[PDB]
Amino acid sequence: AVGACVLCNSQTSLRCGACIRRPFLCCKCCYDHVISTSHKLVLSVNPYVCNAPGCDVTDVTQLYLGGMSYYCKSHKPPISFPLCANGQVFGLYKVTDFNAIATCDWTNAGDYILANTCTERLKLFAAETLKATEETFKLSYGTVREVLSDRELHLSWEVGKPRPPLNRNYVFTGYQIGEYTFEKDAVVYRGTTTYKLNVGDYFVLTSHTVMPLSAPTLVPQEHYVRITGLYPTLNISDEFSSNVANYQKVGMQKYSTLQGPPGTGKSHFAIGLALYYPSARIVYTACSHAAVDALCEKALKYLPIDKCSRIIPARARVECFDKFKVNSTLEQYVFCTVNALPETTADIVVFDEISMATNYDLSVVNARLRAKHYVYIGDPAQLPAPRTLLTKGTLEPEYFNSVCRLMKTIGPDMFLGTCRRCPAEIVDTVSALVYDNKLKAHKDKSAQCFKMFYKGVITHDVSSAINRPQIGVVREFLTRNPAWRKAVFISPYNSQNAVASKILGLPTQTVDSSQGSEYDYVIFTQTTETAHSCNVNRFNVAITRAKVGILCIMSDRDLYDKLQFTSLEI
């Protein structure tokens, strides 16, 4: 029960029993915390409480030290001194920001802003407090009535508690018969495992214990004068020649940031780093299984298949890359999600899709992976990890995580400025929208990029929006543009996606789940004109999925006018 103060590192024996993480606080800092918040319980070898029989006084400001025990004003002996005096709480070895992180409920965007602009140690405490606050709430949200078929169900809920939204962010566990997701009387049930399940089975949200954090989100930066710990090859392929200047900067710094807009070659950069440093052992990590899978696919073409291994938790979350040797931690090239990372060492660590990472994830990576060099690849102009507790305000990219903050304040170390995937109409649009006209297009205009302003009629299934007339507009477009039936339908709402799947028969994806993918033809309906559907990062992701053509049914005049597409009438 002896440690370092979370604000001043000054050693102390006092903890705050009211904070959910019970951090160590120094005599001065613990004082400033109890007099400015409702947190009044102080812990030590023994709890600072009145030891008189039947007394419930726990406020440290109402407690004194008499003998070797603690008492209140009504039980203290004549010879006693106050625990709280001289700007200090009594302990061994005898701020405004810390109070806010410790007492907020993480429902306002200002809470996440403070968690990214504070000192480095407060970032660790905030990430701990946030994840702990997120987990407790899970134990509280609100049974199959009848099985109709092999993919839909009728559900009945528990009495007295609200219903959690039915999407992919909320994964239920049925009863360890596997993890399930639901989507919206009829509801679609999708269990990762095909276990049998009759009427009466109940499902509960899967909770994962929050472990305390110790490693920082970012290691201390170190700049070198020569390539350290690595041996660069001289005969690099001409496919990776343009990255040699930035490849050398990787070996001369502890960490490096790379902002890669869509289609600029992020995975091409990451895989070629292994060819430029052929003797290095590399762990490729990311938050999602799809991001690590994309890095596996690029590796299969360029890296020896016998030196690659994909780490899969027996948790069998989803089907992952099955073309590398499974669960071989000691291989040269290791592909693994952050949550499943083993405790090992590496020459370089590549963290992909950095905008989807939380400050918790940055800490787990540093705690499990000791490496000579870390490279963070991503794009703060794309989508972040969902903060389910955040309901008031929008989280700006500078407050996504420590890495995204640096990319937006001082800029990224390296930048990929040429998009090779999208037609010029899409590139010019997003370049002016979120990239300061610094993103150039390798392709010409395709003349297959169209936009249409059509508000339609907005209906809602609970909280997910639907715009059937916008789908009807798409229907009429398909009958007149037959080559587009191979397109992918994208929208910001799962429900609009479910309706479009039945009416149009196209493959469907949400904008958030389409990040990292690319398709020849994309059809996008904005559905609504909300802050969710008008988010510039979401929109940037949505329209940069197309390789050849895109059709945008717009609800927002601003974003409609900013689209440099040909307008179609109907």
Identified binder of Zn ion from the candidate list 4, 20, 41, 52, rule CB under 5 A: 52
Element (DSSP H or E) covering residue 28: helix 27-34
Q: Give the x-and-dash track for 10-49 against Zn ion (CB under 5 A).
A: ------x-xx------x--x---------x----------
Q: Are 443 and 422 in contact (CB under 8 A)?
A: yes
Spell out the alpha helix ranges (H) of 423-515: 424-434, 468-480, 494-504, 511-514
Which residue number, 39 or 545, has a Cβ lying nearer to Zn ion? 39
77 has binding-site annotation: no
Asked if residue 430 binds Zn ion (CB under 5 A), the reply is no
**CB 277 to Zn ion: min, Å:** 43
Torsion of CA 169, 172, 173, 177, to 10 degrees: -90
Asked if residue 296 binds Zn ion (CB under 5 A), the reply is no
Which residue number, 77 or 386, has a Cβ lying nearer to Zn ion? 77
Which residue number, 50 or 474, has a Cβ lying nearer to Zn ion? 50
Pairing of strands 144-147, 152-155: antiparallel
75-81 contacts, C-beta under 8 A, 24 or more apart: 75/50
Spatial separation of the C-alpha atoms in residues 429 and 472, rounded to whole Å: 26
Spatial separation of the C-alpha atoms in residues 563 and 11, rounded to whole Å: 58
Q: What tokens were used for 388?
A: 């389910």
279 has binding-site annotation: no
80 has binding-site annotation: no
Asked if residue 104 binds Zn ion (CB under 5 A), the reply is no
Return all residues near 53 (Cβ < 8 A) that are at least 6 apart.
none
Spell out the alpha helix ranges (H) of 252-350: 266-276, 289-302
Q: Give the x-and-dash track for 55-94 against Zn ion (CB under 5 A).
A: x-x--------------x--x-------------------
Residue 76 CB-half CA count within 13 A: 17
Identified binder of Zn ion from the candidate list 4, 8, 100, 385, rule CB under 5 A: 8
**Amino acid (one-letter) located at 269:** F
Which residue number, 125 or 521, has a Cβ lying nearer to Zn ion? 125
534 has binding-site annotation: no
Which residue number, 80 or 242, has a Cβ lying nearer to Zn ion? 80
287 has binding-site annotation: no
Pairing of strands 440-441, 418-419: parallel
**CB 67 to Zn ion: min, Å:** 14
208 has binding-site annotation: no
Spatial separation of the C-alpha atoms in residues 325 and 338, rounded to whole Å: 19
Per CB under 5 A, the segment of 96-104, 113-121, 204-212, 327-335 that binds Zn ion is 96-104
Return all residues near 181 (Cβ < 8 A) that are at least 6 apart.
166, 167, 168, 170, 171, 172, 189, 190
CA-based Rg of the chain, rounded to a whole angstrom? 27
Which residue number, 56 or 322, has a Cβ lying nearer to Zn ion? 56
* Residue appearing with tokens 């005599």: 27
**Amino acid (one-letter) located at 41:** L
Identified binder of Zn ion from the candidate list 102, 286, 311, 441, rule CB under 5 A: 102
Pairing of strands 464-467, 458-461: antiparallel
296 has binding-site annotation: no
**CB 222 to Zn ion: min, Å:** 28
**CB 527 to Zn ion: min, Å:** 43
261 has binding-site annotation: yes
265 has binding-site annotation: yes
**CB 208 to Zn ion: min, Å:** 24
**CB 39 to Zn ion: min, Å:** 3
Which residue number, 129 or 382, has a Cβ lying nearer to Zn ion? 129
Return all residues near 411 (Cβ < 8 A) that are at least 6 apart.
none
Asked if residue 50 binds Zn ion (CB under 5 A), the reply is yes
Residue closest to 256 by CA, chosen among 107, 395, 371, 174: 371
Which residue number, 29 or 130, has a Cβ lying nearer to Zn ion? 29
Partnered with residue 348 across adjacent β-strands are: 282, 373
264 has binding-site annotation: yes
33 has binding-site annotation: yes
Which residues sit in the known binding site for a ribonucleoside 5'-triphosphate?
260-267
Which residues make up the interface to Zn ion (CB under 5 A)? 5, 7-8, 16, 18-19, 26, 29, 39, 50, 52, 55, 57, 72, 75, 102
Which residues sit in the known binding site for Zn(2+)?
5, 8, 16, 19, 26, 29, 33, 39, 50, 55, 72, 75
Which residues sit in the known binding site?
5, 8, 16, 19, 26, 29, 33, 39, 50, 55, 72, 75, 260-267
